[PDB]
Each structure stands twice: as structure tokens, then as C-alpha cells.
Design an enzyme around this catalytic site. Structure first.
Site, PDB file in Angstrom:
ATOM      1  N   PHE A  22      10.195  20.474  -3.128  1.00 54.26           N
ATOM      2  CA  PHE A  22      11.703  20.639  -3.323  1.00 54.26           C
ATOM      3  C   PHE A  22      12.138  19.603  -2.390  1.00 54.26           C
ATOM      4  O   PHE A  22      11.658  19.146  -1.738  1.00 54.26           O
ATOM      5  CB  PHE A  22      12.056  22.000  -3.040  1.00 54.26           C
TER       6      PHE A  22
ATOM      7  N   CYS B 163      16.869  13.336 -18.063  1.00 53.64           N
ATOM      8  CA  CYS B 163      16.969  13.777 -19.624  1.00 53.64           C
ATOM      9  C   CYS B 163      16.906  15.217 -19.485  1.00 53.64           C
ATOM     10  O   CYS B 163      16.394  15.856 -18.549  1.00 53.64           O
ATOM     11  CB  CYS B 163      15.670  12.840 -20.566  1.00 53.64           C
TER      12      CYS B 163
HETATM   13  C1  LIG Z   1       9.990  17.058  -4.166  1.00 48.77           C
HETATM   14  C2  LIG Z   1      10.965  17.588  -5.293  1.00 48.77           C
HETATM   15  C3  LIG Z   1      10.820  16.554  -6.343  1.00 48.77           C
HETATM   16  C4  LIG Z   1      11.890  17.293  -7.461  1.00 48.77           C
HETATM   17  C5  LIG Z   1      11.972  16.352  -8.976  1.00 48.77           C
HETATM   18  C6  LIG Z   1      13.065  17.089  -9.797  1.00 48.77           C
HETATM   19  C7  LIG Z   1      12.773  16.157 -11.261  1.00 48.77           C
HETATM   20  C8  LIG Z   1      13.336  17.143 -12.349  1.00 48.77           C
HETATM   21  O1  LIG Z   1      13.828  16.510 -13.347  1.00 48.77           O
END
Ligand SMILES: CCCCCCCCO
Length: 210
Positions: A153, A170
Site C-alpha cells: 500500500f 484506467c
Molecule cells: C505499493 C502500492 C501500489 C498501489 C498501486 C495501485 C494501482 C491501482 O491502479
């Protein structure tokens, strides 16, 4: 019964990624407890399993010319940005087969952290990550290999939110992005945000932090 927290501070994406993989291998082997890495990255764009060229407004070369690193990765989701002021957490946990449950627990932890600041956040029924109204407070995108998670996250604490404008998600989403700083009108200490995350993970997962 326990999870290990490591605060890596500010680490380049590529080196931190290599570290993720090393930590992952140890957890897979049963030679390390479930581990939560907490850190920040220098400005970087990453492109996950659902990402395409349409997720970048400019050519890849523009990003590198303008102070971003850029990487294609195997986590869920499409494009995202990490930079100073964003608390990145990589829970490298033995989740087994239950990935959706794990995502919900990360979400719950982040909702708890927001609540600690007086902020009402929610996973939303329809959008990945954690939202405050129409704006995304925390992006979530994980990978699971050999029953152990990686990636994780990215909670916007004091992030330069203007850096998100150059990337183009997207699919189904809200309108914008937000941070603790934006919501509260002042910077929040990163040390505190880390402590609040650890406490939330401890409560949600029912594990003692070491
Ligand atoms: C390490 C957290 C990366 C979150 C990436 C979210 C991309 C969802 O479109």
C-alpha cells in the site's frame, strides 16, 4: 502471534524491490516472521499487471528526463506514483490462498489510521484502495507468490499530490487523490504515521509488533 516491522526510511525503488524479494524468500522458508516494511521512495512511476501505455500522459522518456524513475512490476492494478511524503508499506505476510481477505485487512488498517486523525475513509464498494469521499487517500496493489504477499500500500501523508497529474489511471475510479496533509491543512510527521500504521496492523491482524 508476532510481526516484524522494519523502517527502511527513504530507499530507491529498485534496491527496495530487491530487498522485498529477499525478505519474501525468508518468509516463504519459514525463517522470518511476517514482516511489514515501512518506507518512502524517491519519485517513481510503477506500472502493474493492468497497466498499458495509455496510463502515461507523456512518453516514458519524459518521466526519466523530469526526475522520475519508472518500472514495470507484477502487483495488482495499473499505474501509480510514489514519492517523498508518501508512506509505502510492504506487508510480506504468509497469506496462503486468501488474497481478497488480505486486501480487506490492509484496507481496514488504513481506515483505522484515517479514523485516528478524525478522517472518515472507506474502501468503497467499487474502487481499489482507500478513499475519503471522491479522493484516493491510499493506493493498494499486491502480489502473492508461494503463499506469501509482497508489494502492498501507499498512504499519502505529505505527498506532492501534483505528481499524480502526469499519470492516467484506467477503469472505475473516483475523481482525485488526497493526503493527510491536504485533509488536515498541515504536514503530519512521518514518524507518527508509521507508528499509527503499525498499531492499526497489530489490531487488525491480531499480532504483536516487534
Ligand atoms: C505499493 C502500492 C501500489 C498501489 C498501486 C495501485 C494501482 C491501482 O491502479
Amino acid at each position: 502471534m508476532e510481526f516484524l516491522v522494519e523502517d527502511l526510511g527513504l530507499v530507491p525503488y529498485g534496491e527496495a524491490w530487491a530487498y522485498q524479494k529477499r525478505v519474501h524468500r525468508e518468509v516463504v522458508a519459514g525463517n522470518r516472521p511476517p514482516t511489514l516494511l515501512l518506507l518512502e521512495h524517491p519519485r517513481v512511476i510503477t506500472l502493474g499487471r493492468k497497466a498499458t501505455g495509455e496510463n502515461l500522459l507523456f512518453p516514458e522518456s519524459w518521466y526519466r528526463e523530469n526526475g522520475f524513475e519508472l518500472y514495470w512490476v507484477e502487483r495488482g492494478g495499473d499505474v501509480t506514483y510514489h514519492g517523498p511524503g508518501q508512506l509505502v508499506g510492504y506487508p510480506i505476510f504468509p497469506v496462503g490462498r486468501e488474497v481478497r481477505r488480505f486486501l480487506r485487512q490492509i484496507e481496514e488498517a488504513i481506515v483505522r489510521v484515517a479514523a485516528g486523525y478524525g478522517i472518515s475513509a472507506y474502501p468503497t464498494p467499487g474502487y481499489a484502495g482507500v478513499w475519503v469521499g471522491e479522493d484516493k487517500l491510499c493506493a493498494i496493489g499486491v502480489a502473492v507468490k508461494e503463499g506469501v504477499s509482497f508489494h502492498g500500500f501507499a498512504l499519502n501523508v505529505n505527498t506532492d499530490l501534483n505528481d499524480f497529474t502526469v499519470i492516467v489511471p484506467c477503469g472505475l475510479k473516483g475523481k482525485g487523490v488526497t493526503s493527510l496533509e491536504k485533509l488536515l491543512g498541515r504536514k503530519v510527521p512521518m514518524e507518527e504515521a508509521k507508528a499509527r500504521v503499525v498499531a492499526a496492523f497489530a489490531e487488525v491482524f491480531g499480532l504483536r509488533p516487534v
